[PDB]
Assembly symmetry: D2
């Protein structure tokens, strides 16, 4: 259930991840951001704990957990480091997720199992320079020739691009079929015909890598296709439905640690004779931050539990992602404000939380796309 | 319409029963109840027969033996039908029966609970006074012991069901020098010598409910009319409001849900620039924000109910739910008017009523500002723990 | 005319006009506002007194019986009057901007003498019939028609939502003279009330501005003289739009009055209500609400005065009038909502005026183009500016 | 662009001169200034030669002989180009020269204003301390009289231009018993014996300005370094802040404008779903809301500037301008990032920088919370008149 008693596997998992975060991520979070340093040693240890492959079956090397467990772990990890959070989220939902749900027995053996322990991680390449929200406009092409698919085109904004050893790539096998002409492919990295673009210099989550995947006469075997030709758009969308629960959970952790920072500070900063928490406006700020965060967690857990129970969860996932991301930006903004001048400098982690929060309103579907998704499903329920 | 969580089949069936009752008995009368300020007597009687006026009361006392999750679901479905009918039911459940269940004697429960579980008699809750609402502990109505009697003097203000209730849980200071350790709770019959009703308030909304002062002038009641012991009245009132706030949260969910229902149905059939309003992206975004606000507040509300059912602390969670639901009901009913356009402003559509009805949920059983104080205090305590 | 500095200190004539309308509102309007609302009573005697003061024809030349003032003066007066009574404000705003406005701007000298002059003294007022039951936000979709027949036009169709419908003696009516031309096939017509062919619909029962009448005008083969057309055929769409640009300044000013009187009520109440041992104004949350109310009100007024002065200075003001109407209308609802909240229980009942101010404010977000329409207007003109 | 009712020809030409300077000298360096946290010395010197560092300063003292309306327009156009350059400029104008001009002697103006009007030397303003920024009056840095000199002890905090300034206006307590009324203001050369600079702060934004503590240890200055009489320090600080808040409001206007500039050009040239972004209703509504927030905040700002120019009271008005402009800058820069999508999160575009620069305007020269307190105080005092 929801806060109303968690199962004890999930409660133990919560404490496990919270212990890992505070011991292994809190002391490195500031350096990862300032040095834009990929946290390889921390990622490997998380692999050992099963956090990089949580809903993956144990026979494939995964933890055998569920998406409520994933959501809890994503929050605790992201509370400690937002970049570490997104690295983990991409491996779980966006890379392993579609291969589990749509892959061959042999594709799972070759592409899931070597990516469950933290020695290798994957990435997800849907967006392109000309189109992100308009995912169905993918114009990277895949052409069948001989025993190969031949890939040509640029994918953009690919998280883990510089550290991953495989990608789920969406390319159009016939642009005239529009979002029925997209297919999904498993692409090893590195590979001939594939070049990495320059790393993006980002506002936040600076410990993750983000770079273009440039395909030029890139040949991969025919059986690299995930599913059948034309399934790619559905594969991408059902993958993002799961991924959005991950990003919602990341935002929950950014929000929680920004709120932790503000409460501790306000309890010890003195003004006009008393701690800041004696001022009414400060109490109201804290109350509204706690309300935004706790209700967005309820939405997140609802989406996660619907998925686990094999129920439709597209609208609920979108709601959780929208609510958590906007709450993470509003809470991190008010945490800066509560710190005052100290909110604006590196002596405190509030300015970093604000920068990290801002991305959760953009990737895996902007807040605008989330609102469209919610409207679409709301109206169908009334029909 | 929401697809949320794992409902027990008992509560799934209760939702359908209540929704069917509301659509069949409440929807046709909501406009008349509001426009004519008409207490919906026949429907309250019928709800009483169903167990809706005494949901959390044990069956051996005449109640339905349900839980507070069931109460929240019923309150939403009923208030969706009629916002006045909702509050009337919520007062009887949380604010009148609730404290007597939790603090009464055996003799008090069989005398003051059981006859108020079927819809032939309802009660009310009298804490606020003209000089003080939010500052509840400033109650200056007095109760003085004399002979075999308590003697009550003073005016309670804003009492919902004042003109239809047959009993009241009244809070009065047995010694004002003790401040909010000087309040006591009393069971008072209505009517009774020494008690006069003030004129009914002319309200913005919830027009079906009566609201009026209770004016005590040398009003004598039996010595054993006291609920609890002298001086625990303040805590009786606060623990009662903690439970009532889940009711008002659920009332706000109903208003919000029926305002959204109204907006969707209208936007699907109103044509503009060649097509239904639901083809306009701006209208889609309004509806999505309304659905999110509503479904968010319901999860908060259900959490507080389920927490109380599991005997866990729930003061902070009850206040969050009441706060979120009430501000959502005002926001959603505002945007439902807006989606209807000119028709949103006229009495032959229900949207302007929902907006008037919503507004009260931000005020009573503790204003939004009090809820934020309550939330902040408990949040801070949790961090010091 | 109008220096930039006059937005910061009014010309003495405008400062005098403010005090004069405020005195009038508090003496004549404050005592009756609640009655006008609860009884849905057209305030005929007060509109007459305002007509004698020039407030019903502020922009009208003195030569034609008007006050000979400008739109800055009109906005100041609309605020003070609406602070007294929101209904009286709208009634005054329709006559100034929506009825007289288009006739001064697009009429011949003959038409002004016949249709402006008898409507400048408060004995007759006008109205503006653009909306129809099937279309309020797209003016251009007028299905009411006007067909030429000899020395007459013949009007057929139902206009909807007409403020002053049950009290006006003339209407500016928009009708399609060429359906095929859509947007360029609309024309504007001066119509007498009563007149054969015209039936009034039932009055609408509304949330607020209850003192004003709102009803359909039903035209069934209704004939009017040929020179009733305002401008030339096809100009109706431009006339409606340019009229609504002026009218939006009037509605912004009405919203300012509703907001100001709601804020007046909240300050007086919070200063004299105690809680937890001190006035409400000692509570930090209350101070913040009041400050937020004042900011929203004062910036919306600066937007409104800007639009008025631009119009007075013969500059474009479509975007600026839309910003003013949008800002002031949303400020009126937010401020009136927070005034209720500051009053607590008293904010929900008729003992106090706060709940009425909430209901009155709600209309300003809808009429003369909803807030959504205002944002579309603002966006279109912002993009034109960058091009 | 926006509209204004006729600006004087003076100010129209100033706007164009300042916009030309910003687009030619500041736009090409803005990214480097931010990324390398590099003080824009050559540009500041050029601005000094134009009069921009001493705008409301009499020409006979080396200034431009302009007014605060002109200052607000120049602040906006400069900050539209570089938010760091804007604050460096705003500190010299309002925070350093302002109080010397308003409270200084003929001789103090000659020695402390004139050498700081041409960009060769700039000043700074030291009121905050590590333990108190909002609580102004709680200044624990002391200044004791020692015959014909003053001796200062204590640490001032968060001083912008600290590492580039040749003089500070420093506030220190000359009578700690007198609290609010025992503060004084002092003109301090930089560098000077007894003064040490803290390490530069590493900041979210305006990274081209320097920010550091000023540490006074037995720092001796002549007797006529005091501005005004002993005890006038708190008033000098508050009236200086009233002026500076118009400067920060204008800085925020320029950050807001350049963010909206970037979003409009981007949305007009980015396609999605077969059409430009500006064909989407939600994008149109964002842009309209950004435009409205910016233009109304500028009107509030110009009102405060003109009142000051006309020597009318302007405390509430400056606080409203600063509050509205600063919250607008954050909201507008936020929505600019959103309109750009992925491009809003990276240095390929300048939106992420604008987001970071805007954030400081809600904090310094009085947080939004303090601004609301100032507004509330003067509203109530006006009502009590
Ligand atoms: C740090 C980072 C990491 C990323 N990692 C990945 C990754 O691993 N894999 C991957 O596939 N992608 C990734 N992306 C891409 C990301 O998902 C996109 O940025 C986003 O989904 C699409 O936005 P866009 O950048 O193309 O902007 P655009 O799609 O051009 O959107 C521009 C604006 O239009 C708005 N808009 C409003 N209404 C509509 C409407 N009806 N239709 C369309 N747009 C509308 C959008 O909300 C946005 O404000 C990443 C992006 C970032 C910034
Ligand atoms: C329709 C209706 C029915 C009602 N029914 C009942 C009933 O059946 N039983 C009953 O007992 N009561 C009832 N009430 C009373 C109701 O609960 C009060 O109206 C409410 O608690 C607030 O009290 P007040 O009216 O005294 O406002 P005030 O307490 O005077 O409050 C005024 C303003 O100050 C604010 N404020 C107060 N204290 C603080 C603080 N410490 N910090 C910050 N802000 C503060 C408030 O939030 C509010 O905005 C009813 C009220 C209404 C309107
Ligand atoms: C009290 C009152 C008095 C009135 N008085 C007058 C009068 O004197 N004269 C007169 O001519 N009219 C009058 N009206 C009509 C009024 O101007 C219209 O109500 C209003 O403009 C909206 O039209 P509508 O009611 O048809 O709503 P609709 O146009 O149906 O709009 C419904 C919803 O869709 C939105 N919408 C519509 N078009 C678009 C679009 N393109 N993009 C996005 N959203 C859109 C709207 O904003 C609204 O939320 C009055 C109305 C009222 C309530
Ligand atoms: C980049 C930068 C440059 C600066 N430059 C200068 C400079 O040149 N000169 C200078 O003198 N200072 C300067 N400052 C200091 C700046 O003005 C202060 O940081 C600011 O006024 C807030 O004070 P504080 O940092 O001590 O925060 P605090 O006062 O500790 O504020 C903490 C929080 O409590 C709130 N709060 C405080 N008091 C109250 C109250 N009474 N009621 C309600 N809420 C309250 C605040 O609004 C804030 O949210 C600078 C700061 C920064 C970040
Ligand atoms: O990410 C997805 C997009 O990114 C695009 C992109 C767009 C404009 C520019 Cl100008 C650039 C150059 C650059 C500059 C600076 C860089 O590194 C440091 C140095 C200083 O600060 C940062 C790296 C790259 C790249 C790709 O071209 C596009 O196809 C993708 O849609």
């Amino acid at each position: 259930y929801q806060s109303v008693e968690l199962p004890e596997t999930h409660q133990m998992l919560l404490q496990t991840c919270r212990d890992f975060a505070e011991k292994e991520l809190f002391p490195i979070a500031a350096q990862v951001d300032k040095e834009h340093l990929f946290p390889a040693a921390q990622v490997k240890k998380m692999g050992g704990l099963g956090l990089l492959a949580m809903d993956v079956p144990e026979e494939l090397g995964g933890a055998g957990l569920d998406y409520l467990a994933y959501a809890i772990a994503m929050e605790e990890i992201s509370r400690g480091c937002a970049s570490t959070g997104v690295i983990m989220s991409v491996n779980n939902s966006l890379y392993l997720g579609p291969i589990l749900k749509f892959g061959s027995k042999e594709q799972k053996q070759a592409w899931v199992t070597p990516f469950t322990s933290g020695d290798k991680i994957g990435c997800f390449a849907l967006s392109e320079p000309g189109n992100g929200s308009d995912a169905g406009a993918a114009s990277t092409t895949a052409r069948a020739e001989g025993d190969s698919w031949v890939l040509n085109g640029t994918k953009a904004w690919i998280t883990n691009a510089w550290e991953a050893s495989a990608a789920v790539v969406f390319a159009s096998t016939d642009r005239a079929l529009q979002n029925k002409g997209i297919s999904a492919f498993l692409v090893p990295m590195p590979t001939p015909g594939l070049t990495l673009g320059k790393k993006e210099d980002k506002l936040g989550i600076r410990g993750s890598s983000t770079a273009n995947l440039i395909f030029e006469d890139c040949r991969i075997p025919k059986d690299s296709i995930l599913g059948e030709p034309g399934m790619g758009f559905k594969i991408a969308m059902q993958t993002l439905d799961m991924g959005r629960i991950g990003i919602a959970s990341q935002a929950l952790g950014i929000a929680q640690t920004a709120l932790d920072c503000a409460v501790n500070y306000a309890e010890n900063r003195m003004a006009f004779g008393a701690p800041l928490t004696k001022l009414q406006v400060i109490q109201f700020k804290l109350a509204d931050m706690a309300l935004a965060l706790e209700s967005a967690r309820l939405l997140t857990w609802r989406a996660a539990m619907l998925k686990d129970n094999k129920k439709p969860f597209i609208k609920e996932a979108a709601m959780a992602k929208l609510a958590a991301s906007e709450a993470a930006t509003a809470i991190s903004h008010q945490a800066i404000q509560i710190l005052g001048g100290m909110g604006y400098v590196t002596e405190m982690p509030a300015e970093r939380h604000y920068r990290d929060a801002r991305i959760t309103e953009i990737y895996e579907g902007t807040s605008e796309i989330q609102r469209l998704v919610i409207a679409g499903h709301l109206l169908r329920s009334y029909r």
